């Protein structure tokens, strides 16, 4: 299925991973920035910073939008733990101007400390399910979010959330795993990618080097192969 | 117009208050919430509700009210 790494591309990656100015303006949209120095974090084994991702999930729900293709609404980062760590009204408030349930699917980018990982809520198949390549399960999470729904539907839709039937839980040995030490954010994205196109997951490892860079020219040009 | 009031969260849970007139460009509120309450800028990230403030945008321009609230975190890295 793989969309090849043509010379082309190659040649403006490899140009903006050089050591050059770090604060140069790249590429915008999304109302997001980002720098050469945002972009290093996808080079060797670089630590993903927020800004790629946030980014990445802007573009993984302007694709939901297309024909044939379940809608989706993706939070910022912060979003998660500001929830965790401050509460509902701390929040109240970021979707303001979105009905969270006017959509198939909500994706929940998540920063624990030192590590990346994703939550989904599929209201279609009724249950908010957690994602860590590591393997690490965080059920509280589901639980936090399925709390979140309730409190927005009294917020917004003036009436409580209808719980009956709904699955929350995590995923295991079930898919790929981490395989390093670094590749969490881009598991993270790439998970979320495969999701989002209602296809399955099929990609291990090797397939982030690939992917890594594929990503740099997908952020650039707004576009996802 | 008219000048207005705005707090400045910290995921440290300190609110900082500034006023200024609703036409302005953030760049003088930012930078001097880096300066007074030392803190990077090259390391942080400002959001109104969600929406990420960029330094180009002003108040009106973000359809922002007296005593409104921004929220700003770390920047944020993972493996």
């Known amino acids: 299925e793989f969309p090849e790494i043509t010379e082309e591309m190659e040649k403006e990656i490899k140009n903006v991973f050089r050591n050059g100015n770090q604060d140069e303006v790249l590429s915008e949209a ?40 379940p809608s989706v609404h993706a939070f910022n980062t912060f979003f998660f733990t500001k929830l965790k760590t401050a509460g509902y009204q701390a929040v109240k408030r970021w979707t303001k101007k979105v009905d969270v349930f006017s959509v198939d699917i909500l994706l929940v980018p998540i920063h624990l400390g030192v ?30 979010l399925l709390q979140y729904l309730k409190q927005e539907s009294i917020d917004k839709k003036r009436k409580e959330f209808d719980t009956n039937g709904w699955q929350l839980f995590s995923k295991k040995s079930q898919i790929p795993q981490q395989m390093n030490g670094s590749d969490c954010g881009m598991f993270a994205c790439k998970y979320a990618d495969c999701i989002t196109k209602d296809r399955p997951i099929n990609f291990t490892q090797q397939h982030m080097p690939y992917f890594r860079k594929r990503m740099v020219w997908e952020i650039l040009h707004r576009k996802l192969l | 117009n008219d ?58 321009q973000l359809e922002m009210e007296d005593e409104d609230t921004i929220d700003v975190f770390q920047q944020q890295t993972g493996g």
């Not at chain 1, 999304?30 to 630590?47: E, S």
């Open chain 1, 115 to 144: 590590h990346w990982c994703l939550a989904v809520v599929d209201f279609r198949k009724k249950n908010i399910t957690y994602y860590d390549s590591m393997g690490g399960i965080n059920n509280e999470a589901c639980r936090i």
């Open chain 2, 3 to 60: 000048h207005i009031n705005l707090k400045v969260a910290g995921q440290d849970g300190s609110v900082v208050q500034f006023k200024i007139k609703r036409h302005t460009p953030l760049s003088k509120l930012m930078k001097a919430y880096c300066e007074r309450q030392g803190l990077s800028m090259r390391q942080i990230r400002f959001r109104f509700d969600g929406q990420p403030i960029n330094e180009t945008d002003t108040p009106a």
């Open chain 1, 30 to 69: 999304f109302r997001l920035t980002i720098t050469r120095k945002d972009i290093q974090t996808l080079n060797h084994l670089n630590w993903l910073n927020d800004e790629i991702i946030n980014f990445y999930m802007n573009m993984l729900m302007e694709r939901s939008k297309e024909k044939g293709l």
